[PDB]
Design a protein around this ligand. Structure first.
Ligand SMILES: OC[C@H]1O[C@H](O[C@H]2[C@H](O)[C@@H](O)[C@@H](O)O[C@@H]2CO)[C@H](O)[C@@H](O)[C@@H]1O
Ligand SMILES: OC[C@H]1O[C@H](O[C@H]2[C@H](O)[C@@H](O)[C@@H](O)O[C@@H]2CO)[C@H](O)[C@@H](O)[C@@H]1O
Ligand SMILES: OC[C@H]1O[C@H](O[C@H]2[C@H](O)[C@@H](O)[C@@H](O)O[C@@H]2CO)[C@H](O)[C@@H](O)[C@@H]1O
Length: 357
C-alpha cells in the first residue's frame, strides 16, 4: 500500500456539503488517504468555529447548557462515515504543536504553565492529553456504530502535528514524550498504526547536511527533534516528514533541490531503520517565482522511484460557504497552498500521479 494523499484541516467543523465536497474530490482525484485534525482545544477556539471537542479539561464535546453548537465528534463521525463510503483512508492527528485550534499552548494555559514545551513535561498536562485521546479513540461513531478504535477507515493515529521542543535541543524530551504517548495509544488501540506527525527534523547526523547550506536549523537539531531516534521507538510504526522550503529559509532557486535532498535523506534513513516513511505534508507557495507543478512532479517522482510509501500535498479543499467562499465559490486559498479538483496543472499532476502510486 503506497499512495498519493492530501491534508484537510476543517473536516471536524464544516458542513455536510463542504465535507462531501472534499472527500468526493479526493475520490475523483484518486487521492487514497486524507490527513485531518481530530482536535479542537480551548473554549475560545471552540466558540470561534461554534464546534466543541475539548473546550476545558475533562470536558469532551459540547459543554452542558451550551445549545445550538456543533459537536466536533459528530462532525468527525460524519467525515469518517463518508470516507468509509467513498473508500478514502484517514490519518487523524491528536494535538497541534501550533496555536491554531488551541494546540499545546492551550493545554499549557489550562494548567498554568509558562512555556509551550511544558506540554511535554507537566504530568497534569500529559494526563489531560491521555484523557482526551482515550475519549476520542473510544468514541462510538453515530453514523456507523463502530468505535474509532475498531474503524478500518482510520489508517493511523498521529500524536502531534509538527511537534517541536526548542527548550531541549538534545532531543531527549520528545523521545521520552513520544515513547510514553505512542505506548499509551497502543494500549488503548491494538489495531491501528501510530506515527508522530512531526516535520522530520534531524539533529546533526554525520553525512547529512542541507542542500546549498540553507535551512541548516532543519538538519542540526534546533527544533529539539531527533527524527532518527523517534523513528526507532518500538511503538511508532512509520516515519512522517513535512516539506516547506519557502517557510524554512530556502531560496526559491533552491526549493526543488533542497526538497529533493530532504526527501532522499528521509527515505534513506527510514529504509535503514526498516519502517515505512510518508512525506505527509509538502507545499510551495502559488506565488513562488518557480514552476510549482514541476517542483511537485520532481518530489513525487522521487518519493515514487526511491520506494517511499506515500506523498501527501498540503492541501486539498472543496466548495466553500458563508464567510469562507472565494471568487469561484471554493473554500479560499488562505495560505497559497490550496489545490482543488479543477483544471490547474497541479490538479492535473495529482490525478496523473494518483494513477502511478
Ligand atoms: O435520509 C437519508 C440521508 O439523508 C442525508 O444524507 C445525505 C448525505 O449526507 C450526502 O452525503 C449524500 O449521501 O446524500 C444524502 C441524501 O440522500 C443525511 O445526512 C443522512 O443522515 C440520511 O441518512
Ligand atoms: O505560528 C502559528 C503558525 O504556525 C504554523 O506554521 C508553521 C509551519 O507549518 C512550518 O512550516 C514552520 O516553519 O513555520 C510556522 C511556525 O513558525 C501553522 O501551520 C500556521 O497556520 C500558523 O500561522
Ligand atoms: O488553521 C490553519 C489555517 O488557519 C488560518 O486560516 C483561517 C482563516 O484565516 C479564517 O478566515 C477562518 O475562516 O478559518 C481559517 C482556519 O481557522 C490561516 O489564515 C491559514 O493560512 C491556515 O492555513
Amino acid at each position: 500500500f503506497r499512495f498519493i494523499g492530501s491534508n484537510n484541516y476543517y473536516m471536524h467543523y464544516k458542513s455536510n456539503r463542504m465535507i462531501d465536497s472534499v472527500l468526493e474530490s479526493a475520490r475523483d482525484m484518486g487521492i487514497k488517504v486524507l490527513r485531518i485534525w481530530g482536535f479542537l482545544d480551548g473554549e475560545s477556539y471552540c466558540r470561534d468555529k461554534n464546534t466543541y471537542m475539548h473546550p476545558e479539561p475533562g470536558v469532551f464535546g459540547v459543554p452542558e447548557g451550551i445549545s445550538n453548537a456543533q459537536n466536533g465528534f459528530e462532525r468527525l463521525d460524519y467525515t469518517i462515515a463518508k470516507a468509509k463510503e467513498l473508500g478514502i483512508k484517514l490519518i487523524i492527528v491528536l494535538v497541534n504543536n501550533w496555536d491554531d485550534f488551541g494546540g499545546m499552548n492551550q493545554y499549557v494555559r489550562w494548567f498554568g504553565g509558562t512555556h509551550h514545551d511544558d506540554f511535554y513535561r507537566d504530568e497534569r498536562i500529559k494526563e489531560e492529553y491521555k484523557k482526551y485521546v482515550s475519549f476520542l479513540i473510544n468514541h462510538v461513531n453515530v453514523y456507523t456504530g463502530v468505535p474509532y478504535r475498531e474503524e478500518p477507515t482510520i489508517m493511523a493515529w498521529e500524536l502531534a502535528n509538527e511537534l517541536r521542543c526548542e527548550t531541549d535541543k538534545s532531543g531527549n524530551t520528545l523521545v521520552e514524550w513520544v515513547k510514553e504517548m505512542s505506548s499509551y495509544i497502543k494500549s488503548l488501540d491494538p489495531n491501528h498504526l501510530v506515527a508522530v506527525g512531526d516535520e522530520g527534523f534531524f539533529s546533526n547526523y554525520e553525512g547529512f547536511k542541507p542542500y546549498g547550506g540553507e535551512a541548516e536549523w532543519a538538519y542540526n537539531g534546533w527544533s529539539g527533534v531527533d527524527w532518527k531516534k523517534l523513528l526507532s521507538i518500538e511503538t511508532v510504526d512509520f516515519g512522517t516528514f513535512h516539506l516547506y522550503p519557502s517557510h524554512w529559509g530556502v531560496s526559491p532557486e533552491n526549493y526543488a533541490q533542497w526538497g529533493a535532498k530532504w526527501i532522499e535523506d528521509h527515505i534513506k534513513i527510514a529504509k535503514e531503520i526498516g519502517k515505512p516513511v510518508v512525506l505527509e505534508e509538502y507545499g510551495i507557495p502559488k506565488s513562488a517565482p518557480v514552476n510549482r507543478t514541476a517542483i511537485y512532479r520532481l518530489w513525487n517522482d522521487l518519493v515514487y522511484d526511491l520506494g517511499g510509501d506515500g506523498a501527501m500535498f498540503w492541501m486539498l479543499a472543496g466548495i466553500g460557504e458563508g464567510s469562507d467562499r472565494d471568487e469561484r465559490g471554493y473554500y479560499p486559498d488562505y495560505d497559497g497552498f490550496r489545490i482543488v479538483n479543477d483544471d490547474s496543472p497541479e490538479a492535473e499532476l495529482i490525478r496523473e500521479y494518483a494513477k502511478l502510486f
